[PDB]
Amino acid sequence: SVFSERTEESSAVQYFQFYGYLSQQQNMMQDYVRTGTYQRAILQNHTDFKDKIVLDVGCGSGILSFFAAQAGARKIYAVEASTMAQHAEVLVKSNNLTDRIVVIPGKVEEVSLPEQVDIIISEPMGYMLFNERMLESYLHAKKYLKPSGNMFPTIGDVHLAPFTDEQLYMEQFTKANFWYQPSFHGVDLSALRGAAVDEYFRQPVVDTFDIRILMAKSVKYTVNFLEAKEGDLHRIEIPFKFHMLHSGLVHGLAFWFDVAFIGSIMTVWLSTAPTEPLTHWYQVRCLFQSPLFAKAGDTLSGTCLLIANKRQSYDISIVAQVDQTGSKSSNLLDLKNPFFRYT
């Protein structure tokens, strides 16, 4: 019930529908950084899997469960709510692993497991880490975890930093300026320019960028999956205080994330930072409707507030001010309706 109480049925339907397509499974699997890093984290920490009981939350086609099997797991429960669970069981049979991988269809909040597990594996990260709200299901699954059990990934770091990108800003500004026309085919649309700018700038921009646009060292917010409770993710407050390293216009904040697999042999990191090879998560940028001017040495301070919604995403509120001048910017963004600019 925990899942259905926090998600609107309609949104949950299209969510699991989307993940029922083999095309989408291929798109994630082809991300070699993602898939190779997961296999590295599991195989190089084989002692965390040898003869262990494993739970794979949201297994999709089952790839992570096959990795756990390669590392020596005795039994893997692979739970998946989408229709992809049928395809995972096909692969388990065709790979002759029916004695080790047990697919359990359904939501991890609703299924029944015959025993507790030694370790949980999953890929719960969406855009900006938190999109899709799957981290809550990942944390919810800890009810099946033995007292000192491990979790792969173990921690997650969200990074944020201010950036300058006049071209991106003007791109979105010019789109909104379509509603500034006083005679579009003889019709005055100008009364809607305010609503247009609001709508367009609520869209986080998902693409990659060169690190030269960042105007300060990132601030990091860490979630320890071993300790966090799923309710901790309903309201995420990220205060920030940036020491500006460059002078110029701050057009918004850029976001990315890293996760760490903290195994008994080594810690393996999966990073989506703009300094690292591109992944299918890219990076996320929240634009200010009006940029803030800042000088090198100034401090940009404020709060990024993420409130979970029933569409398996978050309402984003970013309040930022230049302390030296009192220049202030307040912004509201809709993480579930981003602008995919990558081309």
Binding site: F18, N27, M28, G126, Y127, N131, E132, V206, H280, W281, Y282, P338, F340, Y342
Partner: peptide, 4 residues
């Protein structure tokens, strides 16, 4: 492509 990306994850949504």
């Amino acid at each position: 492509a990306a994850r949504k």
